[PDB]
Paper text:
As proof‐of‐concept, we designed protein binders to target three distinct epitopes on two different oncogenic targets; vascular endothelial growth factor (VEGF) and interleukin‐7 receptor‐α (IL‐7Rα). Using the described strategy, we sought to design proteins able to prevent activation of the VEGF receptor (VEGFR) by quenching the receptor‐binding site of VEGF. We named the designs utilizing the first scaffold Sam and those using the second one Sima. We selected eight of the best‐scoring Sam designs (Sam0.1 – Sam0.8) for experimental validation.
Based on expression yield and preliminarily estimated binding to VEGF, we chose the best‐performing design from each group for full characterization: Sam0.7 and Sima3.2. Analytical size‐exclusion chromatography revealed that Sam0.7 is monomeric, while Sima3.2 exists in monomeric, dimeric, and tetrameric forms. Sam0.7 and Sima3.2 have similar melting temperatures, 63 °C and 65 °C, respectively. Analysis of the kinetics across the injection dilution series, assuming 1:1 binding, resulted in dissociation constants (Kd ) of 190 and 14 nM for Sam0.7 and Sima3.2, respectively. We obtained crystal structures for the unbound Sam0.2 and Sam0.7 proteins. Alignment of the experimental structures to the corresponding design models showed that there is an atomic‐level agreement with overall backbone Cα root mean square deviation (RMSD) of 1.8 Å for Sam0.2 and 1.7 Å for Sam0.7. Further analysis of the per‐residue deviations revealed that regions with the highest mismatch (Cα RMSD per residue > 3 Å) correspond to the outer rim of the Sam binding site (e.g., R56–M58, A64, F95, A96, D119–V121 for Sam0.7). We ascribe this to the open and closed conformations of Sam in its bound and unbound states, respectively. While the designed coordinates of Sam were derived from its complex with VEGF (MD‐relaxed structure, Experimental section), the crystal structures represent isolated Sam monomers. As expected, the results showed that Sam0.7 competed with bevacizumab for VEGF binding.
Numbering used by the authors: 0 to 88, 95 to 121
């Protein structure tokens, strides 16, 4: 019932694809109704699709130039995966961990941030 390591690799690759073109609505679509986003990890957690959109509206909603992987997408056999990327508007480096539910949607996301 959980996404395979291969499905996780395609889901996380799709995430980067949409971040890089500033596709807010399609990113929010990847989240489960009651998902949690901890980005940056340590800041107040974001609960539910409406508030998670505010975060992507805040991150992409004035426009983005590019977002690109800086290493392999790593997937578990447990419906989770991890990938490092760099965003550009200005610049920031991000290490993201995602857990998927049995429907292929993001239940939880943690992003570790680094200043460029």
């Amino acid at each position: 019932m959980l996404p395979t390591a291969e499905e996780v690799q395609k889901l996380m690759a799709r995430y980067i694809e949409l971040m890089d073109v500033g596709d807010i609505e399609a990113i929010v679509q990847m989240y489960a109704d009651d998902a949690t986003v901890e980005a940056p990890f340590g800041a107040p957690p974001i609960h539910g699709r409406e508030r998670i959109a505010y975060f992507y509206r805040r991150m992409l909603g004035g426009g983005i130039a590019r977002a690109t992987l800086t290493g392999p997408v790593r997937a578990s056999h447990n419906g989770t995966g991890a990938m490092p990327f760099r965003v550009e508007y200005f610049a920031m480096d991000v290490r993201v961990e995602m857990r998927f539910d049995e429907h292929g949607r993001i239940q939880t996301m943690q992003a570790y941030w680094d200043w460029v």
